[PDB]
């Protein structure tokens, strides 16, 4: 399945940062 980059951005917003798709899975990272 593909990256739901929207739900990743929501999940990482609680941590104060972005939630980018890398190798078809999300990771939280700075701006």
UniProtKB/Swiss-Prot annotation:
**Has keyword Secreted?**
yes
Keyword terms: Amidation, Calcium-activated potassium channel impairing toxin, Disulfide bond, Ion channel impairing toxin, Neurotoxin, Potassium channel impairing toxin, Secreted, Toxin
Tissue expression per record: Expressed by the venom gland.
Tell me what effect the entry lists for residue 6 to A: Small decrease in cytotoxicity towards Jurkat cells. In r-R6A-R7A; 1.74-fold decrease in cytotoxicity towards Jurkat cells
TM regions (residue ranges): none
Please provide one cellular component term from the Gene Ontology annotations of this protein: extracellular region
Q: Where is this region: [R/K]XCQ motif?
A: 6-9
Its domain of life reads Eukaryota
Q: Which family does it belong to?
A: Belongs to the short scorpion toxin superfamily. Potassium channel inhibitor family. Alpha-KTx 05 subfamily.
User: What is the protein name given in its UniProt record?
Assistant: Potassium channel toxin alpha-KTx 5.4
Organism (species): Hottentotta tamulus (Eastern Indian scorpion)
- Lineage of the native species? Eukaryota, Metazoa, Ecdysozoa, Arthropoda, Chelicerata
């Amino acid at each position: 399945a593909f990256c739901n980059l929207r739900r990743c951005e929501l999940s990482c917003r609680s941590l104060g940062l972005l939630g980018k798709c890398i190798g078809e899975e999300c990771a939280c990272v700075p701006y």
